[PDB]
Amino acid sequence: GNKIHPIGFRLGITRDWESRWYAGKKQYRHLLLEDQRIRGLLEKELYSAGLARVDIERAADNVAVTVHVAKPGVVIGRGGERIRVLREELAKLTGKNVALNVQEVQNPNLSAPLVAQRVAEQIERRFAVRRAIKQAVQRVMESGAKGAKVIVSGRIGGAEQARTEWAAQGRVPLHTLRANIDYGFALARTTYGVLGVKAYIFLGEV
Amino acid sequence: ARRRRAEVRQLQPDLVYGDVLVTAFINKIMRDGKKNLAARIFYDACKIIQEKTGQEPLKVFKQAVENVKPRMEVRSRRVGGANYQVPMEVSPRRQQSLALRWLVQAANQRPERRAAVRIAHELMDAAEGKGGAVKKKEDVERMAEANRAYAHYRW
Amino acid sequence: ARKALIEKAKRTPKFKVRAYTRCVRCGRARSVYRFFGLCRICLRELAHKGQLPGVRKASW
Amino acid sequence: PRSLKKGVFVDDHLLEKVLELNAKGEKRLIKTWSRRSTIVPEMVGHTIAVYNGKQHVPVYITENMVGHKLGEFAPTRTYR
Amino acid sequence: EQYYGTGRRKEAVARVFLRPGNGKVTVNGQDFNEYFQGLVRAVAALEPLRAVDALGHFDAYITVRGGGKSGQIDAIKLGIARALVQYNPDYRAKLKPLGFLTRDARVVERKKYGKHKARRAPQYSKR
Amino acid sequence: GKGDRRTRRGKIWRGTYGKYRPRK
Amino acid sequence: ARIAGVEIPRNKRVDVALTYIYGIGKARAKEALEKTGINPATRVKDLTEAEVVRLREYVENTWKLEGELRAEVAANIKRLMDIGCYRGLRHRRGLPVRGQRTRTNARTRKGPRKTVAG
Amino acid sequence: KIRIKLRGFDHKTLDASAQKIVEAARRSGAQVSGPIPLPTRVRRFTVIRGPFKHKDSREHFELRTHNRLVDIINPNRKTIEQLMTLDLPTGVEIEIKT
RNA sequence: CCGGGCACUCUAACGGGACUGCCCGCGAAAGCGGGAGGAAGGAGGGGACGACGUCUGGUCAGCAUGGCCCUUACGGCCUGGGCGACACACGUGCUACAAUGCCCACUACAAAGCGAUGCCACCCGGCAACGGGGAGCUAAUCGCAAAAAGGUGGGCCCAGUUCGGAUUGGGGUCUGCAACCCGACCCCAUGAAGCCGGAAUCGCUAGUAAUCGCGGAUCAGCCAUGCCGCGGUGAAUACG
Ligand SMILES: [Mg+2]
Ligand SMILES: [Mg+2]
Ligand SMILES: [Mg+2]
Ligand SMILES: [Mg+2]
Ligand SMILES: [Mg+2]
Ligand SMILES: [Mg+2]
Ligand SMILES: [Mg+2]
Ligand SMILES: [Mg+2]
Ligand SMILES: [Mg+2]
Ligand SMILES: [Mg+2]
Ligand SMILES: [Mg+2]
Ligand SMILES: [Mg+2]
Ligand SMILES: [Mg+2]
Ligand SMILES: [Mg+2]
Ligand SMILES: [Mg+2]
Ligand SMILES: [Mg+2]
Ligand SMILES: [Mg+2]
Ligand SMILES: [Mg+2]
Ligand SMILES: [Mg+2]
Ligand SMILES: [Mg+2]
Ligand SMILES: [Mg+2]
Ligand SMILES: [Mg+2]
Ligand SMILES: [Mg+2]
Ligand SMILES: [Mg+2]
Ligand SMILES: [Mg+2]
Ligand SMILES: [Mg+2]
Ligand SMILES: [Mg+2]
Ligand SMILES: [Mg+2]
Ligand SMILES: [Mg+2]
Ligand SMILES: [Mg+2]
Ligand SMILES: [Mg+2]
Ligand SMILES: [Mg+2]
Ligand SMILES: [Mg+2]
Ligand SMILES: [Mg+2]
Ligand SMILES: [Mg+2]
Ligand SMILES: [Mg+2]
Ligand SMILES: [Mg+2]
Ligand SMILES: [Zn+2]
Structure with missing residues (x-):
């Protein structure tokens, strides 16, 4: 019974948060809930697409959901088709008018x-x-x-x-x-x- | 002290006399971390002991602590069954500590109402060669010269 | 915990006193931190993941 | 040391029931699952059955016991 | 003119200003003996000047804050030491052998979980 | 000492206020 | 110094010596010394016959006192006992009333310990 | 009076955004009092490590909200020419009270 | 308080600084003893960090989960009651048995936190809990707030007491739909055991033990004397 989580150790130095924004007493709770909903959805659908990290950032009602993929072809889809359905389904859960972003992991x-x-x-x-x-x-x-x-x-x-x-x-x-x-x-x-x-x-x- | 010698703490000197034994005794009077109240106790006792007898409290304090210091004691040693009381001499540092502890414990076992009065009269009696602290010291020494038949178990 | 036992979420508790925290993720019955809306176990795991910004390893 | 401090609380359930029972003469056994309410003066003379959590125990209500609650006379515990 | 020494002791800060004068030391609008009235160690605050023969050669004004009054006294001691050194550096030869220029770094130690106060372990009985 | 609720020390231990420990 | 139903304090401070009366604590003693116009720090022996008579006037009939008070409390016990109240049952069985735990440390109300086997 | 209350969970982010703002405003305005640091709001949370006891194992984390103040003095136009929207940092948070 | 100013304490971001580098000694080496300089040294103090594995250690009653049983039913709603029961036994604690003490006025010095109907300065009413009114603070500016031990002054006079506050009678506030079971708090009164504790047993090696208050999380309220942090004063001793 030992050996605590390594990334939890690392969060301070030589590692960064999966969500980096600011909030207060009245906002942090359901914003964190919304982040959990985003990661939940992306783990429901994008598991077989080779996704590693979901980094969510917020400035002011602006969302910057960043999906790091091992195969961006399944995320973008043919003609961009699949960046339409689940990018709209993403906004059909949160009324924050959020846009989606993809990135390559080698x-x-x-x-x-x-x-x-x-x-x-x-x-x-x-x-x-x-x-x-x-x-x-x-x-x-x-x-x-x-x-x-x-x-x-x-x-x-x-x-x-x-x-x-x-x-x-x-x-x-x-x-x-x-x-x-x-x-x-x-x-x-x-x-x-x-x-x-x-x-x-x-x-x-x- | 398994590894080191456990170097002795060097107490701060005193603000009134400039002597370290006074600070040590004041620490032995202190309880719950109140060195201010303990210093006031010792110094009101100093005034009382300098007035009720027209001598300097410095040398009376010194002579009392010197009178209470014992020269032998007993320690238990396990040999061939149940342990025995073996006599031996004392360290100077331990003599200091035991003398001050007996001083305080015999002072607070006294009838006098106020603490400073107890301290002053205890110091007086110890400086004269009598009192409770010197009685405990002489009982410690009476343990020696009694079980001296174990003088071959010194260790 | 139990699904129906998150009945607090529709609050309408018939009386204002019957509101308890009920950590959102794990559905905690007993020990919930109100600020995060999570419980100590869920808070521990989520802070280990790195999804709670500003949360570091306390040490002093 | 017991305190309700203003508008001594009596539940509507037995309140309206007993204030309408008094108008037609004294009634026999009543049903009570609300031991949270306070006893009021006009309750004297009736016979009120209160709930232990398991049982229904009748209680003769008198002038002496007005200030107290229903349930002081229905012991929840059972020992020896 | 005037010389400055700060000093610090156990969460206390005692700005000390030294000038020539008669030996009157004031603190926060009170004389040194009215603010520290009836404290047996209050004389150790002006102790650092007894290797330099002040109090008749000198005069002081001190503003102290923080912690308890004993830490205030010792921070006053250290501040007087540094003001004395900035006045005359040769005084160091008589200061550090006495030990008045050393910052006492003993701090109250933080409380640890599983304990009562930071080292006291809860008593068990029948192990 | 601290258990005497109608004295000042028992009032500061419980943190309450009353006749024996007025606020100000 | 007789004040109330039989009550004779002596040789102490008056406000302190009034606590020895049944229905008087420190608060009522301070109130008596206040409204009677008497120095509290006085000894009992130095009390004037007029000061003592005024203290008697006030303390005697302003609150119910020793015999009346004991009988009133005991009759209150009997009152909530003859009714079938739960509090009366706790007074009957000799158990705490204020709503404490009785698994351990009910000693003051239940008396000395009587240790059965196990 | 133009108060700029800067707040964040990251200290280097606050320094970056505040220094960028001041560098932008230093080419137009006054002797600006600049980047004053304010004390940080520290929220600590102690959590028992293992579910279902081992009571005496708890570890704690700490969040800290850092605050900075700018206090630009007499800016008119060129200051706010380099101000409208030019910043990179995301975790930073800016307020303006006058 | 103002004008004003950053030098200072401070707040918080980056750095400097200790490395057995200098000297004596001993030693083949690491290193050891001693000394100066230095804020500091021989790991300066405190954390976070707990190896291959162990005890078939702990919880499927947090979660997730592999199998076996439930289905007008273990599922499900609500009311009441229960987890608070008592002739007993242990564990952990709190308060104490007092004069280095208690109480009363008067006065001074902390750090860490918390607060948008939430913290609540201030006026009024009430012995009081608390109520009415009401300012400010999106909080280095406002508020919780008073720190407590301490200081001077006073009373107590070795006594189950001006020690100790259990128990109980009565009156009353408050949160709440609601305090019989079963809340906290205030006021009057009641004023128990206990006058340093048998065998045995526990914590702590430096700001440590001891003592003193403060805050916090959970929470409408609170049975918190718990727990997690904060600072005030500040030891004794280690032959071995
Ligand atoms: Mg690493
Ligand atoms: Mg994975
Ligand atoms: Mg399940
Ligand atoms: Mg709850
Ligand atoms: Mg609740
Ligand atoms: Mg500390
Ligand atoms: Mg401490
Ligand atoms: Mg244990
Ligand atoms: Mg008392
Ligand atoms: Mg625990
Ligand atoms: Mg100004
Ligand atoms: Mg400068
Ligand atoms: Mg050396
Ligand atoms: Mg050296
Ligand atoms: Mg040296
Ligand atoms: Mg170290
Ligand atoms: Mg270190
Ligand atoms: Mg270290
Ligand atoms: Mg390591
Ligand atoms: Mg196992
Ligand atoms: Mg088991
Ligand atoms: Mg399952
Ligand atoms: Mg295989
Ligand atoms: Mg229980
Ligand atoms: Mg039985
Ligand atoms: Mg104020
Ligand atoms: Mg400010
Ligand atoms: Mg200010
Ligand atoms: Mg501000
Ligand atoms: Mg006195
Ligand atoms: Mg007795
Ligand atoms: Mg008494
Ligand atoms: Mg006695
Ligand atoms: Mg150790
Ligand atoms: Mg609370
Ligand atoms: Mg209770
Ligand atoms: Mg508390
Ligand atoms: Zn949970």
Whole structure:
């Protein structure tokens, strides 16, 4: 019972908030609720489109929802079609007249939440988890990324007893907050149970 | 003190005499962190002890604390079953601490109503060679010279 | 918690006293922070995520 | 030390019921699930059954017990 | 003319101005003995001037604020020290061997959770 | 001391006001 | 110094010595010393026969006092006891009334501890 | 009197926006008193770490709202030529009271 | 308070500063003892941070979840009641048993927070809780606000008391639809045990223990003496 969340540690230095705006006593609550609704919608629909981060900014009734995608072709859609429906459905929930923004993320294997989603996918179809783990750590290690680490939860391969998986490489020092350690969590819901997937990725120094 | 020697705290000098033993005694009188009230106690006792007997409270204080300091005591040592009372000498620092503690505890075990009066009369009796603090000291010394048959267990 | 037990959201409590906080995300029954509208567990997780601006690691 | 401080609160439920019962003569057992209300003078002489939470217990209401509440005479607890 | 020393002790600030005079020291519209009336350690505030033989050679005006009056006294001490040094730097030779130029950095320590006051642990009985 | 509610210290411990501890 | 139904304080301050009367505490003693025009800090022995008689005039008949007060309180107990009130039941069984917990520390109202086995 | 109350959750953002405003106003106006810092409103929240006790494990976070003041003196036009809308920072928040 | 000014304390953003660098000593080295200089040193003080794993530790009663049971029914609404029960037993605490004390006037010095019907200066009424009126503060400007121990003055005189406030009778305010079960608070009266605690056992090595008040979250109200922070004064001792 230890090892608090790494991004919560990192929020101050070498990490930034997923929502950066200002509010007061009378506004913060339902604005945060609106942010949660936005992220909820985008996790309902855009899961298979390869999305990693949703950064929401507000100046004054202006919304700047920024979706970082591993495949922007599914977000934009053919002729822009899909940036019409769910960009309107986005405004059919909040009456704030909000516009949507897309951005490219290179090396989907370099973003920890994307790697978590990938390993969770391969787990849901019941691959041998250790191969997915080591292969993911190599995908990370084959492009910079001076450290990489993967943890999987219990009931591996459908086993009755719960276990714990492993096989990090390089150097992943969660203790020290210096060098932009990224983290992602995924949830594989299968017939035998639920498997948590924690992807730690270490890159850069200062 | 498993690793270090636990270096002794060096108390601040006193504002009236300029002596450190006075500050130590005033600390021993203090309770709940009231050094102001304790200083007032000790200094009203100083006035009372300088008036009721026409001597300097400095040397009477010093002579009383010197009279209460014991030269031997007993410590329990586990040997061959239940432990035994083994006599031994005393450190000068521990003599100081024990003398001041016995002074305060015998002063507050006195009948006198006001605290300063208790302090003053206790210091007087201790400076004369009698009183309760010197009685406790001489009982400590009477523990020695009594179980001296264990003088081969000094350690 | 229980869906119906968020009946506070339609407040109409028949009496002004029966309003309780009922943390929005987790539907907390007991311990809810009014300023965030969340509960200590939901607040902990959401501040870990980084979705609450200005929230840092307190240390002094 | 008990206080209601102005417009001593009596629920409408038994209020209108008993002020209309008095007009036709004394009635027999009444039904009471509202022990929150205060006793008023004109209640004397009736027989009021109050709720323990489980049971219905009758209470003879007299002049002496006017200032108190309905429920002082219906013990919730059961011991020995 | 006039020389300045600030000093600081346990959340207290005592601006000290020193000039020549008779030895009359005032604080916040009160004399030094009326504002600190009946405090046994109030004499330690003018202690730093006893290695320089002031109080008849000097004169002072002090404005103090914050904390408690004991911290005020010790901040007055330190401020007098720095004013004395800015007056005559040679006084350092007689000051630091006494220790009057050192900022006392002992601060009240913050309270920690799981404790009563920052170190006292709650008592358990029958472990 | 602090438990005596009709004295001033018991009033400041409970933080209340009354005849034995008027506000001002 | 006889003031009320039998009551004789002595050798103390008057306002303090009036607390020894049943229906008089510090507040009523200060009120008596106030409206009777008597120095509170006076000793009991130094009280004038006129000062004592005025204190008797006031204290005797302005509030109900020792015997009347004891009987009034006890008869109030009997009054809310003969009615079937819950408060009367708490007075009957010898348990606290003000609405405290009785699982632990009901000692003052329930008397010394009688420890059954377990 | 043109009071510009600056508030934010980020201190470097406040410094950036305020210094940009003052640099814009320094090419037109007076000896401007400039960027005064105000005390920060600190909201602390202590939360028991684990659900379903372990009471004595709680950790706390702190939000802090920083405040800055500008107080431009005698600006007429060229100051507000570089003022209407030119700023990058998002988390910053600006108010104007006169 | 004004004119005015930033030097000062301050507020808050970036920096400087400590590195065994200098010297003596010892040593093969790290390093150790001592000294100067310095605000500060040998990790300057305090946090945040808790390794591979352990105890089949803790909660599916936060959440999410794999299986097994429920369906006019465990689901669902509402009223009342309950979680507050008492012949007992332990845990954690609060207040105390007093004269270094209690009470009464008078007066001085904190930091950290909180407040748009929310905090509520001020006038009036009331012994009071509180009520009426009403100013200001979108709060380094207003308000909570008085800090408390302390200082001087006074009374108490070793006594179950001017210690201690439990219990109980009566009167009364307030939040609230509503205080019988079962709230806090004010006033009058009642004024219990307790006069330093058996075996045993607990916390703390420096601003620490001890003591003193203040604030906060949750909350209409509050059974908070809890919890989480803040500063005031300020020890004793460590042979080993
Ligand atoms: Mg993920
Ligand atoms: Mg596998
Ligand atoms: Mg890092
Ligand atoms: Mg569920
Ligand atoms: Mg609630
Ligand atoms: Mg509620
Ligand atoms: Mg501190
Ligand atoms: Mg403290
Ligand atoms: Mg425990
Ligand atoms: Mg009393
Ligand atoms: Mg707890
Ligand atoms: Mg001006
Ligand atoms: Mg300058
Ligand atoms: Mg050295
Ligand atoms: Mg040295
Ligand atoms: Mg040195
Ligand atoms: Mg350190
Ligand atoms: Mg450090
Ligand atoms: Mg450190
Ligand atoms: Mg570390
Ligand atoms: Mg387990
Ligand atoms: Mg279990
Ligand atoms: Mg489910
Ligand atoms: Mg309970
Ligand atoms: Mg039984
Ligand atoms: Mg005021
Ligand atoms: Mg301002
Ligand atoms: Mg001001
Ligand atoms: Mg302002
Ligand atoms: Mg006196
Ligand atoms: Mg007795
Ligand atoms: Mg008494
Ligand atoms: Mg006694
Ligand atoms: Mg230690
Ligand atoms: Mg509250
Ligand atoms: Mg209660
Ligand atoms: Mg409190
Ligand atoms: Zn929740």
